[PDB]
Symmetry: C3
């Protein structure tokens, strides 16, 4: 369209930023994250929607909807689904014309062993990890490149 259209998907538990495990995920809350993204996109003339769900199937539904509605790019933090949801992987693979960047707040490489592997990353166009909430902004920049 006339402006780039990005969808930011946050997966399960991400609406509990600021409540959950503060030493790992930071002190700022989910509303803070959404506001940060919205204000950054406004400043870049990027249309953005921030979506969050705890449901694997709803995430997939939202990726499918992005196919039909002119979405150019997806920034996705699948939450714990990163480590096991082959269904979200297949959904991301099904939208071949949408650029996708995976984001993790924490340095997943240095946490529990099960967090070291992402089953979604192989079908994404990029990734970021371990940069805190700024990783979302870095992902937007990757898409707006």
């Amino acid at each position: 369209g006339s402006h780039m259209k990005i969808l930011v998907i946050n997966g399960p538990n991400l609406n509990f930023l600021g409540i959950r495990e503060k030493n790992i995920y930071g002190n700022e809350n989910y509303e803070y994250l959404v506001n940060m993204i919205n204000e950054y996109c406004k400043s870049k003339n990027i249309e953005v929607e921030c979506y969050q769900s705890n449901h694997e199937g709803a995430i997939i539904d939202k990726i499918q909807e992005a196919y039909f509605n002119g979405t150019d790019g997806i920034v996705i933090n699948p939450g714990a689904y990163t480590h096991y949801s082959y269904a979200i992987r297949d959904a991301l693979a099904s939208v071949s014309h949408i650029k996708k960047i995976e984001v993790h707040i924490s340095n997943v490489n240095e946490r529990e062993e099960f967090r070291h592997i992402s089953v979604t990353e192989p079908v994404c166009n990029g990734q970021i990890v371990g940069q805190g909430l700024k990783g979302y902004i870095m992902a937007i920049d990757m898409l707006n490149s």
Copy 2:
């Protein structure tokens, strides 16, 4: 009843047949598949319902509903849930009087390593793989045997 009653369940991403990964899943779309099944069942005097969902829990709900509504057989392509959904496995095991056939469009034996194992198949009465959309018809035939 007076006629065999079959439920066909398609799991996540299967509504994107014809859009997704065409070299793997074929050129025909989900509506084509549903029509094919409906016309074949009509010709055999089989009552059929085709259902699709991206939600693991909705699949389980639909299997449970089949217990109460006189369903004789289930044809199920769990999609990527095949490889990890012990919850769908348990659901299929919970309906001991319903015959179940698992279907895969693609030859999962010759794809990525994670696609080689099915956690749902051990509780099904049969399976088909690698026959394209015709596998659904072959599954119906297995049930109508």
Copy 3:
């Protein structure tokens, strides 16, 4: 509050107690279990809610709601999600002020290999297994200690 508030969460397939695999899960049905819990809690002046869902995301939603509504303790039988749902694990970890006890009806240690490991248990305050429906009562007692 004036009385302890407990939430009992049953995961997928548990509403099919008494129908499913009777040699493993027992002859009594889910309504029997709910009644048993309700009558025991009434006798102890404990406020209880019994919730069941087949949906992973709904379970997570319900754990999150417990954060806001003054829930003191959760008894959770995740069903098959025990073996793979890192998303439910993270949800349980996100509610650091709610005591959590994991329950399994069957002796999961002596069943199929995939049932031997729980990804949810490491973030719970306790567990019970292999005691039949009485395990739920034992879990309530653990919380009311």
